[PDB]
């Protein structure tokens, strides 16, 4: 059938990104090899969407959709992965809050880049519950905890530690729907990263601010905590003050 | 002084990559590689001071991202206050400061709050 390559090559010259240039070629190579009428329909569609978008995340998540469909050969094998992006991409057209659009896309991309079944399972469930509610503070809270739980799977936590973190994701959504403050919703993401990475913490509640002390984090792990705490704190509108010193991370959470 | 000529060369490569890609995350992960590529060149120069080597890694990332900085020197402590960073830039800045300091072998006390990241370089 062809006609896919020229759509994928036009994205390569249009974009300035390097990952877009690499995945677009990778999609044109893998789709040419597959012969499924359902797959060449998705790949062709995903490319036409990326050509219209000015968003490097929207283009990246659409490309990573055509790649993971053509490389899988069939559409039934990536039926969940497809809905994970299809929900996150849906959650971008409707919502107008830049926090939600950037959050929902990075959360899907991190989950699709990971392979953990418990990670993709948690993300689809989280995006179903986010797309349902019309509450903005809940959608911004589900995405904070989802993207933080995806970065644990990208960093490669153990099977029994992601389990502990998954229960925390479940407690965060439950507390967000019951109306917990954005401060405590941040402290549940810190606890997810603490439990997720197998450390402990102390909680000082003095006045209107919370102090958390974490010890035993390798520099590769402090980078994941900082990214997860800064991103979730931005989705809640909450001031954080993180101070590093060796293996000790100190977090000061203000509203 | 040959470390300085390697610095100026990596700085052209850092500013040029800021124009070509213009992506809020591809330039960062690239520029961090350049900051560590500078730390590697100065790690095998026993003449070069280990603090000033990290400072040039910091100054390399500051211009790669487009923010400003102020150098406060107090004996053996050099405090660098960097202002105007978002989330992607601070995660990219902290990675570059963690690895270049690990390579030079200096302790760094980094404090992040809002859009400002404060780095202390002892030895």
Residue numbers in the entry:
A (entry chain A): 3 to 257
B (entry chain B): 2 to 124
Reproduce text from the manuscript describing this model.
We use a switchable target binder (host) and a flexible effector that can rapidly bind to and switch the target–host complex to induce a large steric clash with the target, forming a strained excited ternary complex. We show here that by explicitly considering excited intermediate states when designing coupled protein systems, a broad range of facilitated dissociation systems can be designed.
The unbound structures show an open hydrophobic cleft in the new designed state X poised to bind the effector, and the effector-bound structures show that binding the effector causes the two switch domains to register-shift into the designed state Y. Structures of the target–AS1 complex show that the target binds as designed (top), with some strain suggested by small variations among the structures (bottom). For (1), the target dissociates 20-fold faster from AS1 than from an unhindered binder fusion, probably because of minor strain in the target–AS1 complex.
